[PDB]
């Protein structure tokens, strides 16, 4: 069998990419976004990256979005809020990465460097997600809102 793998940023340029899959879902999706790119978006923020245009039809219902508002860093996968965090905490000088793994085990977003502060735990890591194998996003490309050198 011949395999195939899609990576992004292709050539050190943060340009959008289209690659519509016929099966509508990959096998595995691993994304590692540093916490030093949140402090570059405008205060209103936008899409750090995604697998569908933010204004497409049912893009949040079908795809995976990593949004940055004025108050939140959110990871939405098929209308399931995963690992929501307050903005200025990631903007603080303690965040290292954000790892958004999604495979047959489940969708799990990690906020390496951060620990929980509320929500019945207040003592564990910010690893948040769901062990559902049907939460794999629908891939059409990679669409960001950044620009310039990657």
């Amino acid at each position: 069998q011949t395999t195939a793998t899609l990576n992004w940023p292709q050539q050190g340029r943060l340009d959008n990419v289209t690659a519509p899959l016929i099966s509508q879902a990959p096998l595995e999706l691993t994304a590692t976004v540093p916490c030093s790119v949140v402090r570059d978006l405008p205060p209103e923020g936008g899409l750090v990256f995604g697998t569908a245009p933010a204004e497409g039809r049912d893009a949040a219902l079908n795809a995976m979005l990593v949004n940055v508002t004025e108050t939140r860093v959110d990871v939405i996968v098929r209308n399931v809020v995963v690992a929501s965090v307050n903005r200025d905490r990631v903007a603080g000088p303690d965040c290292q990465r954000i790892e958004i793994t999604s495979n047959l085990d489940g969708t799990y977003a990690d906020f390496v460097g951060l620990t929980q502060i509320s929500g019945e735990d207040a003592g564990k890591l910010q690893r948040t997600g769901y062990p559902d194998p049907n939460l794999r996003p629908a891939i059409v490309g990679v669409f960001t809102d950044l620009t310039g050198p990657a």
Binding site: A60, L61, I76, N79, V80, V81
Partner: protein, 395 residues
């Protein structure tokens, strides 16, 4: 086919069955109404409303969101509460005028379950309250339009009357997309609405005993009545509250609710006796052999005062179609002269059963002015081949 009918009657007894009705008619030698004795009706569904325990503090709206209502709003309900999926009646149903070349599909509501707007409320809601619920006494909280929050709500404790075998119910009106468990253990997806019991300590505070999921009769978006029997509550509970979660961000995953209430549950034979005119549909006309259908004498009909309906799927596919106004049914002079209401009704001991309903008829023009007319009967001696003209029967 004999045991499935003997066991259904032996079990499930002294509850309702055709066998039980026939046995009662034989033992009473005739004077016994079949189904108008096992049905409990609630007239005036505004005296059984529950009242919050005095000495509590609330949020911005009132005693329906406890202290921190998040994403839940009084005007948080939709307007078109049509079902997410129609009924899709099966082919071959006897009393249905559906074309055999395509599936028969329709929608329906009871009286105003799914309506629009009305006067204001004690929370500022422009929502129409069904079942005759007064808006000046009935707050509302909803969660429509919050597609980016996934937010919850919790209510304040509502007191409970003393235990009595004639008020075995606590009732809520939701009109949402709630998760519930059927009797056979199955489930409908929906969203989370529950209810907590509790013991309000006189020389102390509340207890928060246990949580309970609702039981209903149909999967729909319009207004309804979720039920919590008092046989589920411990013998020492005295207060109740409401808990809502709504964690889904989809567009059509929301719900609303209303303060709970304990009905009064008068039977269905004392309510409407054997003299009041009643419109009984084609399916429910054999189970009420003591009610008087409205009479037609000289081409004019007398107007009914109540309407007895079969279950929802039977109604919307046979009763609203067979008796249409375009087909000559009794709706010709009913849609033009009378408006409908709804009465909340229950079987005596089967809280999981979707039996039909009862509606009240209100005249568009009162009867003080516009009274009934005189007919001035006469007679002629027509022959056997006259046929003066045809009947206007083409709508």
């Amino acid at each position: 086919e004999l045991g499935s009918m003997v066991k259904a009657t032996v079990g499930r007894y002294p509850v309702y069955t055709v066998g039980s009705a026939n046995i009662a008619a034989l033992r009473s030698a005739g004077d016994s109404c079949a189904m108008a004795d096992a049905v409990l009706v609630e007239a005036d569904p505004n005296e059984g409303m529950l009242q919050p325990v005095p000495g509590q503090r609330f949020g911005e709206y009132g005693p329906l969101g406890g202290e921190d209502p998040v994403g839940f709003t009084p005007n948080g309900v939709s307007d078109t509460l049509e079902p997410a999926e129609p009924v899709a009646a099966n082919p071959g149903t006897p009393n249905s005028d559906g074309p055999v070349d395509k599936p028969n599909i329709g929608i329906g509501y009871a009286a105003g379950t799914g309506g629009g707007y009305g006067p204001e409320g004690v929370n500022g809601s422009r929502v129409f309250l069904p079942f005759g619920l007064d808006p000046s006494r009935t707050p509302v909280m909803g969660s429509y339009g919050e597609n980016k929050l996934a937010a919850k709500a919790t209510s304040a404790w509502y007191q409970l009357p003393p235990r009595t075998p004639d008020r075995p119910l606590v009732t809520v009106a939701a009109a949402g997309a709630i998760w519930y468990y059927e009797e056979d253990g199955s489930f409908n997806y929906g969203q989370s609405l529950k209810l907590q019991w509790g013991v309000h300590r006189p020389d102390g505070t509340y207890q928060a005993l246990s949580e309970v999921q609702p039981i209903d009769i149909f999967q729909q978006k319009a207004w309804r009545n979720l039920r919590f029997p008092l046989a589920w509550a411990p013998p020492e509970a005295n207060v109740a509250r409401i808990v809502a979660d709504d964690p889904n961000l989809s567009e059509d995953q929301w719900f609303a609710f209303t303060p709970p209430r304990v009905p009064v549950l008068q039977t269905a034979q004392q309510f409407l006796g054997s003299q009041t005119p009643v419109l009984m549909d084609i399916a429910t006309a054999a189970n009420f052999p003591c009610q008087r259908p409205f009479a037609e004498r000289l081409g004019v009909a007398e107007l009914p005062e109540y309407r007895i309906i079969p279950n929802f799927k039977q109604m919307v596919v046979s009763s609203n179609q067979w008796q249409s106004a375009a087909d000559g049914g009794p709706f010709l002079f009913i849609q033009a002269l009378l408006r409908t209401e709804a009465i909340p009704t229950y079987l005596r001991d089967d809280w999981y059963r979707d039996w039909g309903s009862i509606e009240r008829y209100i005249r568009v023009v009162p009867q003080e002015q516009a009274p009934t007319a005189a007919i001035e009967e006469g007679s002629t001696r027509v022959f056997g081949w006259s046929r003066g003209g045809p009947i206007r029967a083409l709508p």
